[PDB]
Symmetry: C3
Subunit: 241 residues, 3 copies
């Protein structure tokens, strides 16, 4: 049915001591389905996870490449995955649709697997602009890519609009956003490409709600940015079967 799911930890911080125990936890975890696990981090943790993390299903990922040199030196270091367009990048650093599209394409061209993030704000959601905004984000991405490039691309949907609401997304809300993205890729890139595409849910997820979220037709995993620093990231991985 679905393509290979992805469980991604976006390690954002955390002590070296707790990361270390997390690495042992992951190393000692038996995972019984096909799923690509990812641990994304800044350099200090990356060399740590590279040092002691050893599980056939885990890979490490960068969170940013500053320039051409930073893409190449990262490949030279053993890092083959990179998370791009995530919210810190769009909202604290102010990266535009075009800046993230250009990063996606340049990383693709360097041999990376790319998790590319999209998602609308609260003003946009409330004013009825979700579809235009989100599809404009992925449209800017697609403009800089060839059909082939999509083999190395993963989309993550981040409902940024929900931060500070007190609210978590329903499976219904998540499926709607994912279905919307899936429709666009099918028509514009290809039915084939759309079918192989992993669209990960990037909002607030826990062990409980991940299983119900993953039951939805267009969800192919999670980009997790809180519980990924906790033992329950194991529970999220196991939701992907």
């Amino acid at each position: 049915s679905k393509p290979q799911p992805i469980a991604a930890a976006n390690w954002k911080s955390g002590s070296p001591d707790s990361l270390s125990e997390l690495i042992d936890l992951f190393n000692s975890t038996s995972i019984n389905h096909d799923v690509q696990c990812v641990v994304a981090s800044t350099f200090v943790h990356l060399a740590m996870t590279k040092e002691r993390l050893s599980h056939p299903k885990f890979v490490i990922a960068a969170q940013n490449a500053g320039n051409a040199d930073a893409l190449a030196s990262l490949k030279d270091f053993g890092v083959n995955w990179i998370v791009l367009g995530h919210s810190e990048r769009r909202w604290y650093y102010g990266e535009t649709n075009e800046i993230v599209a250009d990063k996606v394409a340049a990383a693709v061209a360097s041999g990376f697997m790319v998790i590319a993030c999209i998602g609308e704000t609260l003003q946009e959601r409330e004013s009825g602009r979700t579809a235009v905004v989100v599809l404009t984000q992925i449209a800017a991405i697609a403009k800089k890519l060839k059909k082939a490039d999509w083999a190395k691309v993963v989309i993550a949907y981040e409902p940024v609009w929900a931060i500070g609401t007190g609210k978590v997304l329903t499976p219904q809300q998540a499926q709607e956003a994912h279905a919307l993205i899936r429709s666009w890729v099918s028509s514009k890139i290809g039915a084939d490409v759309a079918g192989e595409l992993r669209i990960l849910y990037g909002g607030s997820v826990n062990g409980k709600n991940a299983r119900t979220l993953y039951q939805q037709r267009d969800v192919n995993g999670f980009l997790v940015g809180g519980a990924s620093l906790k033992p329950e990231f194991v529970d999220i991985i196991k939701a992907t079967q």
Copy 2:
């Protein structure tokens, strides 16, 4: 008498776990006077504090905007406050009086409330240059501002010269530096503007000494960069009545 005081936490680091307990502590704190509390941080903690921090007296603040896009995207994210010219920026990053003045003005123009930092080094203090140095710093700030702009400006005095001395400032030393800044604004900008201006003490403060520091005529609060990561930041807030 005084304008509305400000209690500012400049979160510099800290675990997500201890920040989380701090957020509960702040949420459950009853504060019985008019005071604007601020939690300044980098993005990872900001989305956290935005997620779970909910107190009528707290607001969140950024610590830096890299460019025009980073000002705008931050406003779009819900952040209306920014701390600028703080010591990391002047001393590790080497931002000049002019670079911080231009940041202050550009943030003002984007709808931010701005805590702008000034303060002299040890060579400067010891050689008798405090007044010239500090007033030159705020002079560079004022040059890029219109009279109106001051409604969105807060000054924090950071006695950087005291780091490694073993010494903490007396209320007298703090009042002298604050009075000096207040005299300059009154004459150069306006008696009115000077009277509404919040000048925060940004040196080493604890629960004990904050109350005595706040008794001084020209102190309108604190920018705290150590105890703000601890429960006793509550004690500092409560010193502002």
Copy 3:
């Protein structure tokens, strides 16, 4: 025999609470030989270590200067040491041999003591390129320096190739790399300069293996980037006699 050894902690992260206890540990440590201890960090920890760290043998060091202003403002803050070319800089940020050479020289010119890092990757080691690669790195450094400048220069060898191998270097492997660097400096710069030069081992080190590593002829200490956040950094210091 050997020049003054150096024990360098490259604090990469860590809580303010554990750093604080580490500072007390260092302050209460009696060290009975001539050795220069260094604690390198980003600004938040630097002001902390400057605040409370007081030991006749410790100095603080920066990990990066962004520009001319950032060199000068750092000197103005009291920081006289800087670690450059370390792996995060070459591998996450993509700094070239030339970019690090230019940083070394500019820091030298500003009055800094410089720990300059070199070291080969796994592809390079395995394909028999260690000598050419490592000597090309230090050659690029030397090109931007005058003979005199070397009085302010320290070399650290980082065997980056060993991360993820599961393997730690033998004293033999470390001595070979250090001897290789020592031969180059002697011939190209001077027998004298080579003899005063501190070459630090920058791979994975603990209390046990540091003493045996230090017994080697061309090892003048350690750049430590894991145990430097732990009590056993004391043990590493004490290995340098």
